[PDB]
Design a protein around this nucleic acid. Structure first.
Lengths: 113, 118, 122, 54, 214
RNA sequence: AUGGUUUGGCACCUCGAUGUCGGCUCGUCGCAUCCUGGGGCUGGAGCAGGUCCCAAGGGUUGGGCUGUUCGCCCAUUAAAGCGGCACGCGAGCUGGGUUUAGAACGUCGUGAGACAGUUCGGUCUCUAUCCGCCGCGCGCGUCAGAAGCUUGAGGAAACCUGUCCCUAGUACGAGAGGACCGGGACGGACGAACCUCUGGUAUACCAGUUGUCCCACCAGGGGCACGGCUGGAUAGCCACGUUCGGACAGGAUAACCGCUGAAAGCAUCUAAGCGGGAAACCUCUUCCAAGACCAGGCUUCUCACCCUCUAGGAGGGAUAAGGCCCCCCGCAGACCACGGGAUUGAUAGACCAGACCUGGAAGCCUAGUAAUAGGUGCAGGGAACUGGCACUAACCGGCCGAAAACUUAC
């Protein structure tokens, strides 16, 4: 029942799509560039998801220009306007930390068919 | 269940696991045993969860019990009388009674037994 | 999280391939340099035909770190390597080309030229 | 380290008086009719006939 | 003047502000407080207000405490604590039986929370005082965590009192100053205070208007 | 003229033992002040310095070389202070140097050998009695016995600082350059609390897997091999994480700037007085604190019953309010103490549900020659967290624990 649940649920954000580690998503992230708005899209693989309710976080990993990048977002962050799921991955793990040592051909994820 | 806060019972984790398994086997085989009070205190939740497995007695629960008990006659009795006997009791399958101290080392002794009231 | 005697890949085209951190500028007994911090470094590996040479004491700015770094909105950014860009006193690159992504922290630290030159800013 | 001096009798006795035993508290119980004293910690066991009374 | 209330530390959570920044907030159950006694200079020599908080069965109270509560005119509460004011002008706004609730504070106010620090038991100098240990290798013999030197040699001849050594740690009253009140939820009697407040969950705390930033 | 911080001189101190340098760990003090603070004169235009006063609150970096101190150098910094204390600190550590025994080089000696010359190697013992100090209890006292909440005499802690932005490219200045005073933001180092996030850990969690033995065999599991090894991993504890702090204001002052003016018909910041004036001092912020023996205050509860000697006091017993032990426990803890609960009960365990961790159980069916895959099925398993639930254990119980009066005043 998680005693702080009544405080938590007021700020809980709906409309989050269902997704699991291993999926490929694009996170639409609004940014500030000299006091103006725009959405920068981060497309990558969801490698982990640490459940906490409002304190939920997920991590998305992408390879960009030969350097791997990891970004961790709060699931209910208002700085994320919208999350879109592209493909569903087939993995045997809850956390894909082994992908930090794989590049290119070996770093691909099976698609849930 | 909850692990022990301090040092383990037999002097190591593996010895404590074997000790708990043997004590549970003895309890289910005889119905009551006498041992040191901390040993019975540690034994209560372990044996109660084994009895819970035996209560909803299916093949899966049977294999869950066998991965701890290792003695097959005790498993059979646990799944044929002990489980059915506690069918309509929700928890509290055992009780602990404190008895007189040991003489050689003044160790506090206790008796743990299965409840038989209903 | 870069400190003294740490080694960084050079994300520029000055001919330097690798630099060693000598000092983290920005206060006495300062310990670590994250993204956007300026360090004094010596060049350890260099391209044979580049303008810089081994043993040159230069100034660089950290643009990527392995240790994840928190942001104001509760998000985190993390890279697969520690990288730096060799600069001059006016906070401008000594090279003409930045390789790989950089963090957003270079904006609030007023590294506008590096941000503009970067292939992508995250 | 070793004691530099021999203890006086007063100091030795004052420290030694702290090594003592406390008397356990006893409560009455009726087992097989006759009343007898037992520690409260063993009251239930005595009532169940699990403690030997000489 | 300075407001105050008795409450309970519920736990820590997360919220986001209007600029989308995340705020780590401690949730305090600033429950209803009842004024039980007024300390006045003409009688006690100092001006203070005494508040009661918490719920207890009346059979759990002893006769003296029950008598004090009956003389005041209210039913007993678990916790009783005094708030020290400055002068009778600040003591005139409280009367016995008056009920204090969380809405005395406002959004964005600055508060000072007082609680009992968590217990750490017997702690070494490395933990209790942040001593740097000695080396872990290069010949160091069984001194990896010991404090080292204790004093001088002849002119000291003794150990100065106040010397920092190992001992019991924690369990002491601690005040955190200039904490910001992010939100005052009046429905649940809950205060959202940005930061960390002393003690364990379910502990008793006193929230007061800040003495510096107010 | 000071000092015993340098080498000295004396040999009063120890040869029935006073560890010899640096380094590490941990200090404490002085001010002859390195930075920050306040001033004065400038051969001070401003900037910036010179230089001199007052000021000890805090601060005062990391490396290369050498056994080093010392020193030189490299990057910084507001700054990289000088000294006392057995040139502080080996029953706290080291053993690189010096200072045994082995061996070698140069030199000296016929030789055994030698060298405030070099070189390589070379046992650092101890269960803390007393004082001291850091914590924690027991006893008694505080003129009846108790219980809540407190005042504080008196102490302890903390005290650092940078960059940038507005005022302002003005004052000054041939221009260049460059402000005073005052508000704001963001930092570094240090400290405290804390665990929402990030990260670490994880010896009763989940999964994979190697070798071997066992469960009669298959299937499914278990014991051992560092938890066998790997992949994760909630609680708790933590920092690399989060939040907060150093204040503002007042008082008396230092150097100094002054006002009103005598002795000394003027003058003189002075002998009478009155003001300003600093990170130093007192308050102010945080914490401890009535064993503060002047042992405090405000309240509330009990506020009574016998027996003995010779009734002078005493002794004994039984009680009240209340407390302790036993009992169930704790994120409280070495023990003790502290805190909560004790059937008029959710204290712990179990059980039920949720949260979370793992990641798709068994059995069966299907596909495949098989390895194996798919369905049943966000499956199964499970600790700490949350809520229910008296099912189990907190028990037909013991020990403590309340008043001489008198004097004077009203």
């Amino acid at each position: 029942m998680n005693t702080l649940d009544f405080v938590d649920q007021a700020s809980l954000r709906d409309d989050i799509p269902t997704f699991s580690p291993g999926d490929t998503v694009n996170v639409h992230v609004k940014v500030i560039e000299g006091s103006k708005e725009r959405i920068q899209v981060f497309k990558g693989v969801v490698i982990r998801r640490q459940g906490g309710g409002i304190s939920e976080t997920f991590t998305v990993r992408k390879e960009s220009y030969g350097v791997g990048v990891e970004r961790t977002f709060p699931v209910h962050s208002p700085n994320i306007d919208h999350i879109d799921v592209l493909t569903r991955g087939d993995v045997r793990r809850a956390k894909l930390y082994y992908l930090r040592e794989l590049r290119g051909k070996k770093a691909k994820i099976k698609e849930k068919r | 269940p909850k692990p022990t806060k301090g040092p383990r019972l037999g002097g190591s984790s593996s010895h404590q696991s074997a000790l708990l398994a043997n004590l549970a086997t003895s309890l289910f085989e005889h119905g009551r045993i006498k041992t040191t009070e901390p040993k019975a205190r540690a034994l209560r939740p372990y044996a109660e969860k084994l009895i819970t497995h035996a209560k909803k007695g299916a093949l899966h629960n049977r294999r869950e019990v066998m991965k701890k008990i290792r003695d097959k006659d005790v498993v059979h009795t646990l799944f044929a009388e002990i489980g059915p006997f506690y069918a309509d009791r929700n928890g509290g399958y055992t009780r602990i009674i404190k008895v007189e101290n040991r003489k050689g080392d003044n160790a506090p002794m206790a008796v743990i037994e299965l409840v038989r009231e209903k | 999280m870069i400190q003294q005697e740490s080694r960084l890949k050079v994300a520029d085209n000055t001919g330097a391939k690798e630099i060693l951190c000598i000092r983290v500028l920005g206060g006495s007994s300062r310990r670590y340099a994250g993204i956007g911090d300026v360090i004094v470094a010596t060049v350890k590996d260099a391209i044979p035909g580049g303008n810089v040479k081994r043993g040159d004491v230069v100034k660089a700015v950290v643009v990527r770190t392995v240790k994840e770094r928190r942001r104001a909105d509760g998000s985190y950014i993390k890279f697969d390597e520690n990288a730096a860009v060799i600069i001059k006193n006016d906070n401008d690159p000594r090279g003409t080309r930045i390789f790989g992504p950089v963090g957003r922290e270079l904006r609030e630290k007023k590294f506008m030229k590096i941000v503009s030159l970067a292939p992508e800013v995250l | 380290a070793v004691p530099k001096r021999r203890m006086s009798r007063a100091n030795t006795r004052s420290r030694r008086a702290q090594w003592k035993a406390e008397a356990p508290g006893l409560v009455t119980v009726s087992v097989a009719g006759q009343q007898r004293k037992v520690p409260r910690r063993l009251l239930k066991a005595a009532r169940l006939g699990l403690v030997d009374l000489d | 003047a300075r407001k105050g209330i008795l409450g309970t530390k519920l736990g820590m959570t997360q919220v986001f502000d209007e600029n989308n920044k995340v705020v780590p907030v401690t949730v305090v159950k600033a429950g209803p407080n009842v004024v039980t006694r007024i300390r006045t200079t003409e009688r006690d020599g100092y001006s203070a207000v005494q508040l009661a908080y918490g719920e207890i069965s009346p059979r759990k109270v002893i006769k003296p405490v029950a008598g004090q509560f009956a003389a005041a005119g209210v039913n007993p509460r678990r916790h009783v604590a005094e708030l020290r004011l400055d002068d009778e002008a600040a003591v005139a706004e409280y009367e016995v039986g008056q009920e204090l609730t969380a809405e005395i504070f406002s959004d964005g106010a600055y508060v000072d929370v007082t609680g009992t620090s968590k217990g750490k038991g017997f702690a070494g100098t490395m933990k209790r005082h942040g001593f740097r240990g000695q080396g872990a290798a290069h010949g160091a013999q069984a001194v990896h965590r010991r404090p080292g030197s204790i004093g001088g040699c002849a002119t000291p001849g003794r150990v100065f009192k106040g010397t920092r050594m190992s001992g019991r740690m924690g369990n002491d009253r601690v005040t955190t100053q200039n904490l910001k009140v992010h939100k005052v939820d009046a429905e649940n009697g809950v205060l959202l205070i940005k930061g960390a407040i002393p003690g364990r969950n379910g502990g008793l705390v006193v929230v007061r208007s800040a003495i510096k930033r107010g």
